[PDB]
Amino acid sequence: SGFRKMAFPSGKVEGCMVQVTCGTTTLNGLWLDDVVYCPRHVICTSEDMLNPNYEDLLIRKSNHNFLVQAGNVQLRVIGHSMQNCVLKLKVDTANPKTPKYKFVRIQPGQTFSVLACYNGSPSGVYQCAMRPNFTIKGSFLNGSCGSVGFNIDYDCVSFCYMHHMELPTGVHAGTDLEGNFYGPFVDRQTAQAAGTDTTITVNVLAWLYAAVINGDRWFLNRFTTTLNDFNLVAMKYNYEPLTQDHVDILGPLSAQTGIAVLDMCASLKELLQNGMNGRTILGSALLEDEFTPFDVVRQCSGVT
Amino acid sequence: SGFRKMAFPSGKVEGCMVQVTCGTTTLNGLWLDDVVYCPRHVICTSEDMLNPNYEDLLIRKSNHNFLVQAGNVQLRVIGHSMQNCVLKLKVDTANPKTPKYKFVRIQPGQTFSVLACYNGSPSGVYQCAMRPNFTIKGSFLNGSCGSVGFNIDYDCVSFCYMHHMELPTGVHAGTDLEGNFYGPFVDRQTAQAAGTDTTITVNVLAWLYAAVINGDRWFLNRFTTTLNDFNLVAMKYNYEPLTQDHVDILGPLSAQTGIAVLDMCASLKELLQNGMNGRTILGSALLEDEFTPFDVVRQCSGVTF
Numbered sequence: 001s002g003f004r005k006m007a008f009p010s011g012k013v014e015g016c017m018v019q020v021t022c023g024t025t026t027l028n029g030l031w032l033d034d035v036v037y038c039p040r041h042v043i044c045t046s047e048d049m050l051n052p053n054y055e056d057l058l059i060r061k062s063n064h065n066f067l068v069q070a071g072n073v074q075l076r077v078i079g080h081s082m083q084n085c086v087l088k089l090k091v092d093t094a095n096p097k098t099p100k101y102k103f104v105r106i107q108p109g110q111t112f113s114v115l116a117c118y119n120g121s122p123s124g125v126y127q128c129a130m131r132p133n134f135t136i137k138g139s140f141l142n143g144s145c146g147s148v149g150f151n152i153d154y155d156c157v158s159f160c161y162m163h164h165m166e167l168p169t170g171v172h173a174g175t176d177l178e179g180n181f182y183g184p185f186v187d188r189q190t191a192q193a194a195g196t197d198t199t200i201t202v203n204v205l206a207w208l209y210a211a212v213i214n215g216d217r218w219f220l221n222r223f224t225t226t227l228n229d230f231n232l233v234a235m236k237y238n239y240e241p242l243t244q245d246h247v248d249i250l251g252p253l254s255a256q257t258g259i260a261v262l263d264m265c266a267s268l269k270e271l272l273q274n275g276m277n278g279r280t281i282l283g284s285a286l287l288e289d290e291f292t293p294f295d296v297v298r299q300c301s302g303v304t
Numbered sequence: 305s306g307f308r309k310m311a312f313p314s315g316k317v318e319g320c321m322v323q324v325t326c327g328t329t330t331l332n333g334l335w336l337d338d339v340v341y342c343p344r345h346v347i348c349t350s351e352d353m354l355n356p357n358y359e360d361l362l363i364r365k366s367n368h369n370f371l372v373q374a375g376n377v378q379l380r381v382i383g384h385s386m387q388n389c390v391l392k393l394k395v396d397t398a399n400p401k402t403p404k405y406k407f408v409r410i411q412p413g414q415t416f417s418v419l420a421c422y423n424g425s426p427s428g429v430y431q432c433a434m435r436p437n438f439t440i441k442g443s444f445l446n447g448s449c450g451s452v453g454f455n456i457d458y459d460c461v462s463f464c465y466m467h468h469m470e471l472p473t474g475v476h477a478g479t480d481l482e483g484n485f486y487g488p489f490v491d492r493q494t495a496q497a498a499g500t501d502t503t504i505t506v507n508v509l510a511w512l513y514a515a516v517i518n519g520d521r522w523f524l525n526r527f528t529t530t531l532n533d534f535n536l537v538a539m540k541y542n543y544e545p546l547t548q549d550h551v552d553i554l555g556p557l558s559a560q561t562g563i564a565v566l567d568m569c570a571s572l573k574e575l576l577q578n579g580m581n582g583r584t585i586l587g588s589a590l591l592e593d594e595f596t597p598f599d600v601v602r603q604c605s606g607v608t609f
């Protein structure tokens with residue numbers, strides 16, 4: 001029993017964290033084989049922040065203006081490329097603690113663990129979702145830049161996010177490990193707008209199934225609903241559209257509880273109409289959208 | 305910026321997790337130097353668990369009825385003692401990945417990270433607190449027994465909890481690593497239930513400070529109070545008393561926001577009576593008591609391990 005926002009064991013990633021310094025600027029880098037990936041804004045001074053020309057800033061740097069530091073050891077830089085918004089420093093030593101890994105670009109709604117770090121030193125680990133507006137609600141102070149997000153699946157670490165910057169709202173923006181930003185953001189200190197955020201409908205439905213599996217049926221009712229009629233009520237609450245794809249995905253969790261997806265859509269409709277009236281579901285006084293169908297299947301037993 | 309239930313990096317502990325099997329029973333063990341610590345109920349079958357005599361059950365076992373497994377490698381058991389409710393298997397090989405560590409008994413209200421494991425394999429990590437009723441709200445399925453709780457302080461892992469068993473109300477009971485149970489529970493298949501739980505007053509105050517630091521100020525008011533007046537309101541809502549010591553502990557967070565503790569106690573007083581009137585604090589409808597003052601200070605400073 002029990003349900004808890006559970007991050008992956010941070011061990012395989014801690015072994016890849018390094019410190020990258022460029023003049024006075026210092027943030028975190030990921031060290032995999034002989035390469036160190038980090039946000040390219042390491043090469044910006046306080047003046048360059050507003051309208052930086054990265055190619056011009058970078059053609060002015062040699063390898064020896066990049067101090068990579070793996071704990072106590074200094075690492076020797078022997079090459080520097082730039083891919084999109086990440087700097088790729090080549091180093092003389094391949095990371096002995098390189099895990100089995102791939103790079104993946106996740107979609108909005110999907111969850112990852114974050115390993116928050118300061119000076120190539122890990123401080124904490126927590127679970128996040130890519131919001132529909134492409135931001136993440138993270139915990140990140142100054143120096144946390146280049147902290148990475150990841151899933152682990154069978155000893156294979158899937159790096160999906162690198163932290164670049166905080167927005168005036170207090171939410172967080174970053175790139176995939178190929179340096180392509182998530183959302184319409186750029187590594188510039190120009191005012192950029194955090195798009196209007198929605199609740200991830202499919203993740204709430206999964207988390208209701210999770211409550212049924214942990215022995216709570218109190219929120220259910222005898223109604224059904226057409227996919228369309230739900231979405232028309234859903235969107236009135238700033239809930240993301242539910243697609244036929246979201247429905248197919250929830251099939252396994254519907255089957256294991258014998259509550260068809262659109263019955264569960266009705267339970268939610270009513271939950272939105274009413275609130276909780278002093279009850280809680282899985283320990284929460286509002287509806288949690290940061291648990292995916294996959295997440296629920298893993299954490300929750302086959303026994304209902 | 306931002307605030308998150310944040311656990312310690314699990315890597316130093318991941319290196320210590322192993323699989324302990326005794327006949328058909330299998331749960332998780334902690335491997336530090338040449339010793340493997342695990343719940344002693346590994347030596348019990350489902351029949352024995354009704355009223356087990358552990359000293360008699362254990363005098364029946366030789367070292368060769370204990371299969372310790374560090375990933376693929378088999379560890380050879382060369383000695384077995386007991387200590388309270390933990391079994392201590394001695395092994396032929398000292399764990400090369402043994403971190404700097406102590407064993408410590410935490411108080412109710414204080415927090416630790418848990419590394420959930422199934423078959424000596426770590427699956428996930430989360431933060432929880434020792435509740436006042438000595439239970440913990442964890443996520444544990446069958447085979448998660450011997451999963452450990454810990455804090456990290458600089459390089460030093462402080463192991464504080466070992467998972468033994470789940471209770472009727474779906475909360476969790478366990479020992480410190482010296483095998484002394486937290487709360488009035490026994491390692492036995494019997495009728496045991498969690499006492500009436502209280503909300504950890506000092507941790508809620510800390511988490512309100514955390515909200516003020518992250519911009520949420522709507523709950524503040526110009527009104528103050530005295531410890532005693534508040535404690536009468538606390539006790540009414542199944543909230544733990546607030547002591548002069550809890551107040552001194554909140555000193556740093558009061559100073560950094562210039563909201564004296566009893567000002568903040570007034571905000572809470574009112575929050576308890578009059579509701580949150582729709583609004584949320586740090587994206588929560590309820591008042592969160594599973595963040596300590598230390599926890600708050602650390603996350604809003606950024607100190608590393």
Ligand SMILES: C=CC(=O)O[C@H](CC)C(=O)NCCc1c[nH]c2ccccc12
Binds near residue numbers: 027144
């Ligand atoms: C690593 C800092 C972090 O994650 O958080 C801080 C405070 C929350 C922050 O505000 N980040 C902005 C860093 C940044 C954005 N664009 C830039 C262009 C040049 C140099 C720096 C930047």
